[PDB]
Amino acid sequence: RLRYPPEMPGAEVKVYKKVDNVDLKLYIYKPADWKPADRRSAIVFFFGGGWQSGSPAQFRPQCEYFAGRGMVAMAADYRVGSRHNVKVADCVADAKSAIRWVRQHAAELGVDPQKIVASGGSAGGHLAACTVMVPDLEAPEEDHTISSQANAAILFNPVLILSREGLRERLGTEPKAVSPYHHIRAGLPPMIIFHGTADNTVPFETIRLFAEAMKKAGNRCELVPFEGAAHGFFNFGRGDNLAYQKTLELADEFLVEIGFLAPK
Numbered sequence: 001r002l003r004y005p006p007e008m009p010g011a012e013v014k015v016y017k018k019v020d021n022v023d024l025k026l027y028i029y030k031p032a033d034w035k036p037a038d039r040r041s042a043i044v045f046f047f048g049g050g051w052q053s054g055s056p057a058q059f060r061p062q063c064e065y066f067a068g069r070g071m072v073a074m075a076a077d078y079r080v081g082s083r084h085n086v087k088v089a090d091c092v093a094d095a096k097s098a099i100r101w102v103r104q105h106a107a108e109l110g111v112d113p114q115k116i117v118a119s120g121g122s123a124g125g126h127l128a129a130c131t132v133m134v135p136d137l138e139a140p141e142e143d144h145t146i147s148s149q150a151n152a153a154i155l156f157n158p159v160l161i162l163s164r165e166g167l168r169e170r171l172g173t174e175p176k177a178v179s180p181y182h183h184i185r186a187g188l189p190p191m192i193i194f195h196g197t198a199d200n201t202v203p204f205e206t207i208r209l210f211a212e213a214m215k216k217a218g219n220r221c222e223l224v225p226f227e228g229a230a231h232g233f234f235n236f237g238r239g240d241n242l243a244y245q246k247t248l249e250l251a252d253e254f255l256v257e258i259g260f261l262a263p264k
């Protein structure tokens, strides 16, 4: 199914972070007619795997699709528990480093620094959400005057509640500090969420409750239920790629809606 290290044919490889003698890579898919002077939107995908495993190859098909639509699309590698001595808070710092790196290098990348989308599945969906709405947890030696906050998010059955407060050994902080749900506030970037109603790993009600309170704060937060679908339904190769195909179509219309992508 998925392998690590990933095989990423045609991708440009860039090291976005060096930490603990590990070089963390972005696998970059550029569109046709790309030039550094471009101001294209960008999307950074974070794979899932419980902050313990997974592979950047997971979102390789989606990268190819969005580069084919004119986007600078990339899949980030980030540290995980089965390979590195990290906790969830470290994964968050890596995901923020990736967004900060793309913004910092927006001119070399042909990217609009205000059109960077964070995206991910399950644990990497959590990380994407952290880069839009969870404060701090930044790499301490990076230039914090470059924002690590993404400008939109596309989430594939994300984990969004990590503390049972107001309602742990692997987190690296107090639970609330890594929990997107406990940071809902007005003025947040737009996002779309795909989630299965029969998800036994991340209960759908936790996401519906999230999106409800997100709309109350005035945020554009669309939850697309996939009736009877289970955790992971969206992945390439699952079912007959019906869910993979429709999530791409729904994500495409979301990016055109907010002005990041041109209509087909």
Ligand code: NA
Pocket (backbone or CB within 6 Å): 010, 011, 012, 030
């Ligand atoms: Na290339």
